[PDB]
């Protein structure tokens, strides 16, 4: 009846697939909070989680952040007072609302009372990187609370390295959540399936995760599509329903790359059963991923379409070039909300053409696009190198920094005696080091 992500939502931190390291880091902080307070938050314990009034969770969509924060709170007996983007968190309302609970106790904490925190709040300011123009000065006031609160404060966001999030930098314990581990999600998904009365090839359960880029919430929803679609599952159906489901609802981006890369469609015969018009049309079946898909695996095929006496390499270079050209086209299509009339050309230059040059037998296997997550790595690191520059600009363009900050690595990693010497003799602090350490790594 209820969505699956709901009915199968963790009930104990003992069910959060992944980030277990960060969950611990979280739970701890929420434990030593009373003491951290007792000590005026000036004793950064062996964890550092001691000089921070509030914690800042962050990471990709559907990986357990909101589940952890809530759960870690309910586990230490505290009562929860949460807000999110659906609420108005402007500086005005913020100061006329929650500001008042920063040093207050739960009225529910009484009619519930052995609980040691039952009468205390854990403020969960969720979806903070979602505070728009409907929250004037919200981040500022919120970042000010991280310094003057008298109760645990937990903030969640997806992009910690954003400009809007700058005011939060030095003010709180930011624990990172990365994309859960496949085995974790694979194991979890299995458990689900079993309880849902069905089985699935570990190769299917595997590529899903790969498509979902780790979004455990998405896979769960995506996995509830089978039983919800068909009326009655049977002994045999299980093995075949995967097809219609996988090649349609689930891994559709794959059945596209498959068809597109099948040489049988480019041979004189099939060449007219599945016309040029159809090949181009396959593109409009997911014009979002199709270009990414072809580029991803146009070089992992055993071509059957090569002209007589044409090497696999040569034909690839031709598609390589076309892939390149199609890009030029895309950029322009995305430079003017009014250029969609160029998509057909892009269909040809980014998929159909490159494909026809190497279509045939599938040597390896259709892989999801590497470009997306690969675009996260590069981006998430430019932000780092950036803040590092806006700290060394005192001592070359941000570019000349990553192409000259090589020597620095030595006199900052070399042996790790002369510790303090170089470190401080650089005008760097704690975060100035922890940050420069990440990228350099």
């Amino acid at each position: 009846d209820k969505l699956w992500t709901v009915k199968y939502a963790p009930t104990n931190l003992q069910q959060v697939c992944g980030n277990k390291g960060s969950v611990m880091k979280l739970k701890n902080w929420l434990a030593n909070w009373e003491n951290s307070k007792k000590n005026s938050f000036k004793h950064a314990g062996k964890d550092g989680s001691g000089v921070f009034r509030a914690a800042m969770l962050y990471g990709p969509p559907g990986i357990g952040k909101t589940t952890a924060a809530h759960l870690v709170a309910q586990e230490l007996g505290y009562d929860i007072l949460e807000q999110n983007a659906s609420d108005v968190r402007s500086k005005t309302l913020l100061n006329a609302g929650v500001k008042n609970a920063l040093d207050n106790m739960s009225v529910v904490g009484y009619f519930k009372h052995q609980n040691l925190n039952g009468k205390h709040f854990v403020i969960i300011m969720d979806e903070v990187d979602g505070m728009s123009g409907g929250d004037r000065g919200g981040v500022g006031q919120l970042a000010q609370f991280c310094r003057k609160t008298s109760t645990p404060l937990i903030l969640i966001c997806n992009e910690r390295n954003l400009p809007k999030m700058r005011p939060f930098d030095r003010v709180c314990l930011d624990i990172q959540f990365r994309r859960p581990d496949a085995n974790s999600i694979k194991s979890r998904l299995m458990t689900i399936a079993i309880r849902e009365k069905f089985k699935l090839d570990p190769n299917v359960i595997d590529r899903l995760i790969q498509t979902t880029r780790g979004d455990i919430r998405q896979v769960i929803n995506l996995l509830s599509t089978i039983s919800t679609t068909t009326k009655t599952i049977n002994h045999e159906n299980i093995n075949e329903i995967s097809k219609a489901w996988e090649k349609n609802i689930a891994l559709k981006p794959f059945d596209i790359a498959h068809k597109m890369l099948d040489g049988q469609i480019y041979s004189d015969i099939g060449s007219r059963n599945f016309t040029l018009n159809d090949k181009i049309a396959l593109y409009f079946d997911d014009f979002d991923f199709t270009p990414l898909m072809i580029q991803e695996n146009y070089l992992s095929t055993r071509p059957s379409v090569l002209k007589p006496g044409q090497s696999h390499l040569e034909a690839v270079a031709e598609a390589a070039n076309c892939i390149s050209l199609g890009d030029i086209v895309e950029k322009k299509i995305r430079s003017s909300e009014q250029l969609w009339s160029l998509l057909p050309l892009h269909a040809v230059l980014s998929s159909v053409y490159p494909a026809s040059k190497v279509a045939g037998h599938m040597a390896g296997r259709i892989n999801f696009t590497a470009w997306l997550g690969q675009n996260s790595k590069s981006a998430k690191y430019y932000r780092l190198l950036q803040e590092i520059h806006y700290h060394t600009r005192l001592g070359x363009x941000x570019x000349x920094x990553x192409x000259x900050x090589x020597x620095x690595x030595x006199x900052x990693x070399x042996x790790x005696x002369x510790x303090x010497x170089x470190x401080x003799x650089x005008x760097x602090x704690x975060x100035x080091x922890x940050x420069x350490x990440x990228x350099x790594x």
């Binding site: 390589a320 050209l325 070359x396 570019x399 000349x400 990553x402 192409x403 090589x406 020597x407 030595x410």
Partner: protein
């Protein structure tokens, strides 16, 4: 390190006297300094020949998201024209005696942006003086060229770069076995003082401050990887190989390394390969000449670098 021995004054300028004097003879009217446009390779000493000229004119204490100082501010376009026309004009309120503004990477400015800065120059030129640092005065509209000193900044000679080298050791107490170790460095960075120096510190901390004839030149995290890729490209020229080169590129990019930079080094670390005849090479540059444009006209960089390698593996195999 390198930041240490940097000329914090014009009297310290030890490079290109023709200009070092040009700057002195130019600072003879601290109340009348025409706009300035310095162009040239990187690490030639221009950006420093700037903040050193501002203490010569303004107060030496002229050292302190923008880099502001009690005498000047630095603008780095890292839209953008909005900032130019807005910030600047606001700084034009510096009268109620002008103020200097340095435009780093005047190449990173869009045609639609420059046009704004131009008019802005001709406007409050009384309260504002511009110092534009850049390389290759190609993407700079003429309206600007004829409103600022067209000053070039040729890099130091191999023999002149070494001179500034043996000096650093004399202070850091380094042991130079001979001049060789130095002169090799100058030819290694080909003129990039930012390198030759940041280099002489690298192969100096690895040789225990005792420079010996065995000089393991500086080899940054990336530059090396490019060469290992330059190799794989000449050895194994197959589709399966290309797939590998991919992951390498994908990682050079994910580690904040400019794609147009990868192309550059790679395009030349291939031409230095003796195992290639006039043909292969003259076809390699052309392919880079072409794929260079491709990069500046699109967004997904790999798509362009990969296609470059493919055309190469064919030019060879």
């Amino acid at each position: 390190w390198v930041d240490k021995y940097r000329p914090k004054s014009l009297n310290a300028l030890s490079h290109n006297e023709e200009l070092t004097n040009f700057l002195k003879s130019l600072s003879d009217q601290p109340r009348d300094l025409p706009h300035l446009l310095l162009y040239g390779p990187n690490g030639t000493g221009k950006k420093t020949r700037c903040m050193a000229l501002l203490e010569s004119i303004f107060g030496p204490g002229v050292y302190r998201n923008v880099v502001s100082s009690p005498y000047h501010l630095e603008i780095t376009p890292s839209n953008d024209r909005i900032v130019i026309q807005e910030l600047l004009k606001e700084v034009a309120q510096m009268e109620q005696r002008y103020k200097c503004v340095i435009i780093n990477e005047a190449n990173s400015l869009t045609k639609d942006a420059q046009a704004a800065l131009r008019r802005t120059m001709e406007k409050y030129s009384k309260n504002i003086r511009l110092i534009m640092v850049c390389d290759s005065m190609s993407p700079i509209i003429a309206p600007i060229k004829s409103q600022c000193l067209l000053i070039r900044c040729p890099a130091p000679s191999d023999s002149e770069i070494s001179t500034i080298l043996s000096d650093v050791v004399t202070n850091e107490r380094i042991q130079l076995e001979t001049k060789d170790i130095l002169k090799r460095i100058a030819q290694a960075s080909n003129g990039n003082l930012r390198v030759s120096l940041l280099m002489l510190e690298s192969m100096a901390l690895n040789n225990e401050l005792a420079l010996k004839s065995s000089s393991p030149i500086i080899k940054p995290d990336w530059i090396i990887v490019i060469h290992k890729l330059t190799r794989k490209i000449v050895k194994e020229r197959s589709v399966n190989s290309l797939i590998e080169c991919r992951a390498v590129l994908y990682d050079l990019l994910a580690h904040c390394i400019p794609a147009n930079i990868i192309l550059k080094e790679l395009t030349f670390s291939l031409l230095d390969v003796e195992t290639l005849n006039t043909t292969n090479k003259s076809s390699i540059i052309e392919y880079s000449s072409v794929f260079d444009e491709r990069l500046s006209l699109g967004n997904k960089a790999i798509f362009h670098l990969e296609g470059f390698i493919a055309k190469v593996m064919c030019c060879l195999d």
